[PDB]
């Protein structure tokens, strides 16, 4: 319903109407299966491959573990990102990174996501292209965002370590301007 | 659906109240009720109008639900749908009457797309116009539908891959021909040989033909083994028909020389030589028409079954009648009802060799009826067979042509995406939408 | 074509910001933006209506370009085209969905004339109804 | 092959019979005399009928199509002169109006 | 015994077929060679083949054949008539010429 969505999400009514018209225009009532999601991303990322990261966050948006994403699944996830607090965005990010949803990220779990994002740049990168370089990026991340020093980052580990920074905090306010 | 006779049912419930000697009648279910009003559906500028009680008849669809409140404008009091206004009329008329029609002039894909948008299912199309919906949808569907082993499997199942495949195909389509010509010629009785018996060429120059057919069968068996080694599913291949054809074309020579005249009776090798002609079916790989012939013989086997049945029925009937009408005569060749099958099959096919002709009035009358009866019972499967043949041929034509244009539109789409990427690279070297997309890509450029 | 999921892509870009230990993220490209409005196409008296974001999906044609400003009236706020109102519907439905259909009951020459006027090419007719377009056009050519 | 005075002396010599049987001609100078010969002649006749019945519809349809094509071609070439007459009549009328 | 309308059944065609397929044996053994001339039993043996029509119950095509022979009897009438006419004409001409 339009009213229950008016109250569940931080959106106004006209912003809900615009989003619903667009959503249903792109996939009418065959709401989305995990394959059409990736085909929808494929329009925004030429020169690269986006299917793996698309699959990675399709399960983040799928709150229940059904095979499909509805409109409330879509719009609740958009509201928790575009209208929520910085802590809510960070919780969403961490829950995306943590694969098995246990509460801790190991080097394999985030290595997979780093490979996924790197695949999106595509065939040719203007500087060199390596694999131990994504390993180095994972290493720099675990350097910047861990006090456990056990090669494992946790929910509070990521929350309190990701807040102290400056440039990423100026970044994570990008999602408030244009909506 | 039925909601305007509900006052009538309530009024009819008067018959129960005096016989409702049961103490309490239930208190009425009166609630807040507001009148019907005309609601205005503004579909692509075209204004439709209807009572809302008409739309609340099917509450499992877009218009009967509260989903349509996503399309309402409080400032204009109208629902606006940015959809096609010519198919929405069929949806509205489904809500009014109760049956969903199909406009014969409408593209089936647009119709299906609109039905999917509004929540209607194509299963509830009225019987008045539902066969033609299925017709058009069937037609639309059918219109829109390793370096050593798999490379040679791609060469085999497509002889036009490389000129090496073309040469291999044109050389395997040569030993078939030479073996066929050899098996034909080996029976030609030639050479007077005024010193000895008159013999056919095949047994006079015995080894000269042994060389030829041995070469041919070795090539056949080696290319068959190569087909086997390139077969991905080596059990689906064995079950195929061409595999059976090749097996039964090569084995009449193996079975032949294993049991050679070391043990021979003349009544058993003519069968091994007759089977040697079935290798002429190996041309199935070379001519598409010979494959379409098999496809159409298999597509209409229900007609050939009835052909055989009605034919043998008419043969038995007319052979009985002709035998009993022609039994007693001077030198009658109608000695038996089986012996009268010959005549009948020579007469039903309008062949008429003339070695058996009736000589009595009844025989002549019934032969004259047998000829026409055969004509009409053989004229039944021929239109079906030729129609199926032409249909399958023109089907394959359009299939290949559509598979051609599919590559053209794929070329179109990746050309467009290349153009978009070049537009991004151009904007990086310094239209109200691409700004945000390019900014998203630039934010991604963090990766390095 | 795909422009209503762009907010969704921007929101999905949240996964990169924590791993963006590269110092600077690019400043946003915010510009002056005005809402969608219903624009009124007055084709031969018949009034069609659509969001202008629907027409700006193909900017190499008459309706997606600024060429249509030659047909605008500031006093009536409407675009007036003195054209046939029954083939314009197919053009508008091409702008909406993305596939161009062919009405089987329409003369092929009138259809080609309207497509030529609006800047559409007969090459982008959807596969659903494209064999019959070619059929009718072949017959029309060989007849003329 | 093996018969009293068999005229099936060779596989080429058996072409004649077959082409006389597939076309439903049946001269009768060569007829089988064995059960297998009769069975296979009876199958040969029907097989010939069905393999010759394939090109005939195509040929006759193409013939009628080309004939009715030439008809309409000449008729349209006739009416073209009529509309050309119409147009230069109109232009003569405009010059006379001037 | 299962026929609801035991008079509509007797008037049907399959009933006639069954009757005329069974009776050539009854009529046959009632008047057996105790009184026989060879010119009358071959008719009883010819009628014995009409029991092959009892396959009408088993094959739908054989019923559709009867349905279409009855649906277009107006064409078979003209066929028989024109055939008889042409036969008489050409037989007259050929007899007087030959």
CA-wise closest residue to B111 among C99, A6, A167: C99
A88 is in an annotated binding site: no
Question: Which residues lie closer than 8 Å to E18 by C-beta, 6 or more apart?
Answer: E54
Residues A172, C16: Cα–Cα separation, whole Å? 10
Residue-range definition of the domain harbouring residue A48: 1-179
Three-state SS for B418?
Answer: helix
Angle at B334 between CA B332 and CA B338, to 5 degrees: 160
Q: Look at E61 and B327 and tell me if their CB atoms are within 8 Å.
A: no
CB < 8 Å to B402, chain C: 127
Q: Is the dihedral of CA A11, A12, A15, A20 positive or negative?
A: positive
* E53 CA to centre of own chain: 9
Cβ-Cβ contacts under 8 Å, B324 against chain E:
42, 45-46
Burial of A99 (0-12, 13-18, 19+ CB in 10 A): middle
What 3-state DSSP class applies to B149? Answer: coil
- Triad C57, C61, C66: Cα angle to 5°: 85
Q: Residue B48's beta-bridge partner residues?
A: B41
Give CA–CA dist B391/B25, Å, rounded. Answer: 71
Which of E6, A118, D70, C127 has the alpha carbon at shortest distance from B410? C127
Q: Most distant CA pair in chain B: distance in Å?
A: 129
Q: For chain C, give the DSSP string.
A: ---SSHHHHHHHGGGTTTT--SSPPPPP---------EEEEEETTEEEEEEHHHHTT-TTSTTTSSGGGGGEETTTTEEEE-S-TTTHHHHHHHHHTS-B---TTS-HHHHHHHHHHHT--GGGB-GGGSHHHHHHHHHHHHH-
The residues pairing with B43 across neighbouring beta strands, listed in sequence order, are B46, B81
Instruction: Give the DSSP letter of residue B442.
Output: H
CA distance C5 to chain D (A): 54
**Max CA pair span of chain D:** 102
Q: Is the dihedral of CA A147, A152, A155, A159 positive or negative?
A: positive
| Interface touch C41/B45, C-beta < 8 Å | yes
Residue B72's H or E segment, with its range, is strand B72-73
Residues of B in contact with C5 (CB under 8 A): none
Task: Calculate the alpha carbon distances from A102 to A67, A95, B80, B122 in Å.
Answer: 21, 9, 47, 45
Place of tokens 């510009």: C31
B200–D10 C-beta distance less than 8 A? yes
Backbone CA torsion sign across B316, B318, B323, B325: positive
Residue A10 C-alpha, separation from nearest chain C C-alpha, in angstroms: 15
Rounded Cα distance, B93 and B111, in Å: 14
The candidate with the shortest Cα–Cα distance to C125, out of D12, B405, E6, D63, is: B405
- Residue whose tokens read 């080596």: B234
Backbone φ and ψ of C81, nearest 5° = -115, 125
State the greatest distance between any 2 C-alpha atoms of chain A, in Å, as a whole number: 52
Non-local (6+) Cβ contacts of B355 within 8 A are: B333, D28, D31
> What part of A 109-128 touches B (C-beta under 8 Å)?
117-118, 120-121, 125, 127
CA A61 to chain centre: 8
Give the rounded distance of the alpha carbon of B44 from its chain centre: 40
Residue owning tokens 């059918």:
B142
CATH code matching the domain that covers B290-410, chosen among 1.10.1060.10, 1.10.10.10, 2.40.160.10, 1.10.287.70:
1.10.287.70
Instruction: Give helix B108-118 / helix B88-96 axis angle, nearest 10°.
Output: 50
Q: What is the CATH number of domain D1-84?
A: 1.10.287.70
Counting one residue from chain B and one from chain C, the pairs whose CB atoms sit within 8 A come to: 88
User: What CA–CA distance (Å, rounded) separates B222 from B215?
Assistant: 11
Other CB atoms closer than 10 Å to residue B380's CB: what's the count? 17
DSSP element (H, E) containing B132 = helix B131-144
Q: Do the beta carbons of residue B84 and residue B114 sit within 8 Å?
A: yes
Backbone angles phi, psi at D6, to 5 degrees: -55, 130
Nominal resolution (angstroms) = 2.8
Cβ contact B175:B219 at 8 Å: yes
Q: Report yes or no: A41 and C9 within 8 Å, Cβ to Cβ.
A: yes
CA atoms within 13 A on the CB side of D44: 23
Decide if E49 and B327 are in contact by the 8 Å CB cutoff. no
Q: What is the spatial order of strands in the sheet that C78-81 belongs to?
A: C46-51, C38-43, C78-81, C72-73
DSSP string, B374-413: HHHHHTTHHHHHHHHHHHHHHHHHHHHHHHHHHHHHHHHH
Contact flag for C and B (3+ C-beta pairs < 8 Å) = yes
Residue A74: φ, ψ to 5° = -65, -50
Question: Exposed, middle or buried: residue D13 (CB in 10 Å: 0-12, 13-18, 19+)?
Answer: middle
DSSP-derived secondary structure letter, B25: P
Detail the residues of C annotated as belonging to a binding site.
101, 107, 128-129
Q: HSE-up of A20 (CA within 13 Å, CB side)? A: 23
Q: Residue D71's closest chain C neighbor by CA?
A: C143
Nearest-by-CA chain B residue for D48: B349
Chain C residue with minimum CA distance to D80:
C144
**Rounded CA gap, B394 and B169, in Å?**
26
Q: Which of B346, B371, B384, B389 to mutate to test the interface with D (most CBs of D within 10 A)?
A: B346
- Nearest Cα to A25, choosing from B187, C2, C124, B349? C2
B22: helix, coil or strand?
coil
CB contact under 8 A, D54 and B386: yes
**Side-chain-facing half-sphere of D38: CA atoms under 13 Å:** 14
CATH, domain C5-144, list 3.20.20.80, 3.40.1550.10, 3.30.710.10, 3.40.50.300 = 3.30.710.10
Tokens 């809402």 locate to C35
**Half-sphere exposure (CA, 13 Å, Cβ side) for B437?**
22
Which of D24, D31, D54 shows the shortest C-beta gap to B349?
D24
**Tokens in use for B272?**
């091994």
Strand, coil or helix: E76: helix
Chains that touch B (3 or more CB pairs under 8 A): A, C, D, E
C-alpha to C-alpha distance for B229 and B150, rounded to whole angstroms:
10
CA distances from A117 to B418, C18, E69 (A): 21, 13, 75
SS3 of residue A113 by DSSP: helix
d(CA B158, CA B398): 19
Q: Do B320 and E46 touch (CB under 8 A)?
A: yes
Q: Are A156 and A62 in contact (CB under 8 A)?
A: no
Question: How far off is chain A from C121, nearest CA to CA, in Å?
Answer: 23
Task: State the structure-solving technique.
Answer: cryo-EM
Q: Taking the CA atoms of chain C, what radius of gyration do you get in angstroms?
A: 20
DSSP letters for D24-69: T---SSS---SHHHHHHHHHHHHHHHHHHTTHHHHHHHHHHHHHHH
The yes-or-no reply on C/A contact (3 CB pairs or more, < 8 Å) is yes
Count other Cβ atoms within 10 Å, centred on residue A82. 21
Give the C-alpha distances (Å, rounded to integers) separating E52 from B310, E20, E58.
Answer: 11, 11, 11
- Are B389 and D10 inside 8 Å of each other by CB? no
User: Cα separation of E22 and B439, whole Å?
Assistant: 95
Structure tokens at B73: 């404008």
Q: How many CA atoms lie within 13 A of C137 on its CB side?
A: 14
In this complex, do E49 and B321 lie within 8 Å of one another by their Cβ atoms?
A: yes
Tokens of C79: 């675009």
Q: What is the Cα–Cα distance from A36 to A67, expressed in whole angstroms?
A: 12
Reduced to 3 states, what is the DSSP secondary structure of residue A104?
strand
* Chain A: partners with 3+ C-beta pairs within 8 Å: B, C
Cross-chain Cβ contact A167/C5 below 8 Å:
no
Mutation target vs E (from B309, B334, B362, B379; most E CBs, 10 A cutoff): B309
Q: Could you count the other beta carbons within 10 Å of the beta carbon of residue B327? A: 16
* Alpha-carbon span A37 to A58, nearest angstrom: 7
Rounded to the nearest angstrom, the minimum Cα separation between B399 and chain E is 34
Rounded Cα distance between A40 and B386, Å, is 48
Q: What superfamily would CATH give domain B148-289? A: Voltage-gated potassium channels. Chain C (1.20.120.350)
What whole-number distance in Å separates Cα of residue B151 and Cα of residue B154?
5
Distance (Å, whole) CA B101 – CA B98: 10
User: Among C120, C101, C127, C140, which residue's Cα sits nearest to residue B401?
Assistant: C127
Angle at B28 between CA B25 and CA B34, to 5 degrees: 165
Residue D25 known to bind ligand: yes
Interface of A with C in 50-69 (CB under 8 A): 53, 56-57
C-alpha–C-alpha distance, residues C126 and C99, integer Å: 5
Cα dihedral A75/A79/A80/A82 (nearest 10):
130
> Which residues of B participate in the annotated binding site for Zn(2+)?
101, 107, 128-129
Q: Which two tokens stand for residue A99?
A: 């694969």
Short-list A150, A8, A119, A172, CA closest to A74:
A8
Radius of gyration of chain B (CA): 39
Contact criterion met (CB below 8 Å) for A70 and A63? no
CA R_g for chain E: 20
- Collapsed DSSP state (helix, strand, coil) of residue B108: helix
**Helix, strand, coil shares, percent, chain E, to 5:** 75, 0, 25
Contact assignment for B317 to E52 by CB distance below 8 Å? yes
Domain ranges of chain D: 1-84
C59/B431 Cβ within 8 A: yes
Phi, psi (rounded to 5 degrees) for B125: -65, 135
User: Any idea what DSSP says for residue B27?
Assistant: P
In angstroms, what separates the C-alpha of C134 from chain A's closest C-alpha? 30
Give the integer Cα–Cα distance in Å for B98 and B58.
10
* Residue B38 near residue B31, CB atoms below 8 Å: no
Residue the block writes with tokens 């046939």: C84
The span from the CA of E48 to the CA of E46, in Å, is: 5
Cα–Cα dist B242/B245, whole Å: 5
Contact indicator for B95, B52 with CB cutoff of 8 Å: no
- Could you say which DSSP state residue B65 is in? S
What the block records as the tokens of C25 is: 């993220």
- B53 CA: distance to closest CA in chain C (Å): 27
- CA nearest neighbour of C95 among B47, B84, B419, A37: B84
CB atoms within 10 A of CB C46: 15
């Amino acid at each position: 319903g339009l009213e229950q969505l008016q109250e569940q999400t931080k959106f106004t009514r006209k912003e809900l109407q615009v989003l619903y018209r667009g959503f249903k225009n792109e996939c009418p009532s065959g709401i989305v299966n995990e394959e059409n999601f990736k085909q929808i991303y494929s329009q925004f990322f030429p020169q690269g491959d986006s299917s793996t990261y698309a699959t990675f966050l399709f399960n983040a948006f799928d709150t229940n573990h059904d095979g499909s994403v509805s409109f409330e699944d879509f719009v609740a996830g958009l509201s928790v990102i575009l209208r929520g607090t910085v802590d809510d965005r960070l919780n969403w990010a961490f829950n995306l990174y943590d694969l098995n949803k246990d509460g801790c990220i190991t080097k394999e779990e985030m290595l997979d996501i780093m490979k996924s994002i790197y695949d999106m740049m595509g065939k040719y990168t203007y500087p060199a292209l390596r694999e131990e370089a994504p390993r180095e990026h994972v290493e720099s991340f675990f350097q910047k965002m861990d006090r456990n020093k056990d090669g494992v980052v946790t929910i509070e580990e990521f929350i309190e370590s990701c807040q102290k920074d400056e440039n990423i905090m100026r970044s994570m306010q990008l999602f408030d301007n244009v909506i | 659906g039925v909601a305007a006779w509900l006052p009538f049912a309530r009024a009819a419930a008067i018959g129960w109240m005096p016989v409702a000697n049961c103490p309490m009648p239930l208190a009425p279910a009166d609630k807040n009720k507001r009148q019907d009003e005309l609601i205005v559906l503004n579909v692509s500028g075209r204004r439709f109008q209807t009572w809302r009680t008409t739309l609340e008849r099917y509450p499992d669809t877009l218009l009967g639900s509260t989903e349509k409140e996503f399309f309402f404008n409080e400032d204009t009091k109208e629902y606006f749908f940015d959809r096609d206004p010519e198919v929405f009329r069929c949806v509205l008329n489904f809500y009014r009457t109760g049956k969903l029609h199909y406009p014969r002039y409408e593209c089936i894909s647009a119709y299906d797309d609109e039905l999917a948008f509004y929540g209607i299912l194509p299963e509830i199309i009225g019987d008045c116009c539902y066969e033609e919906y299925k017709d058009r949808k069937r037609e639309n569907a059918e219109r829109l539908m390793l370096s050593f082993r798999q490379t040679m499997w791609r060469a085999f199942e497509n002889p036009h891959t490389s000129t090496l495949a073309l040469v291999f195909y044109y050389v395997t389509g040569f030993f078939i021909a030479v073996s066929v010509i050899t098996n034909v010629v080996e029976t030609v009785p030639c050479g007077t040989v005024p010193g000895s018996k008159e013999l056919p060429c095949g047994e006079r120059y015995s080894v000269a033909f042994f060389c030829l057919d041995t070469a041919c069968v070795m090539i056949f068996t080696v290319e068959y083994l190569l087909r086997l080694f390139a077969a991905p599913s080596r059990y689906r291949f064995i079950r195929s028909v061409m595999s059976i054809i090749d097996v039964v074309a090569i084995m009449p020579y193996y079975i032949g020389l294993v049991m050679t005249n070391n043990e021979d009776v003349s009544g058993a090798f003519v069968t091994l030589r007759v089977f040697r002609v079935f290798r002429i079916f190996k041309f199935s790989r070379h001519s598409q028409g010979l494959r379409i012939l098999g496809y159409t013989l298999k597509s209409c086997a229900s007609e050939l079954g009835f052909l055989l049945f009605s034919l043998t029925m008419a043969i038995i009937i007319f052979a009985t009648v002709m035998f009993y009408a022609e039994k007693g005569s001077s030198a009658s060749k109608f000695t038996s009802i089986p012996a009268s099958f010959w005549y009948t099959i020579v007469t039903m096919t309008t062949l008429g060799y003339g070695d058996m002709v009736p000589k009595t009035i009844a025989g002549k009358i019934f032969g004259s009826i047998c000829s026409l009866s055969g004509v009409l019972v053989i004229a039944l499967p021929v239109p079906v067979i030729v129609s199926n043949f032409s249909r399958i041929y023109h089907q394959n034509q359009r299939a290949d042509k559509r598979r051609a244009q599919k590559k053209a539109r794929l070329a179109r789409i990746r050309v467009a995406k290349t153009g978009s990427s070049n537009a991004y690279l151009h904007s990086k070297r310094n239209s109200l939408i691409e700004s945000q997309h390019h900014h998203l890509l630039h934010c991604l450029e963090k990766t390095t």
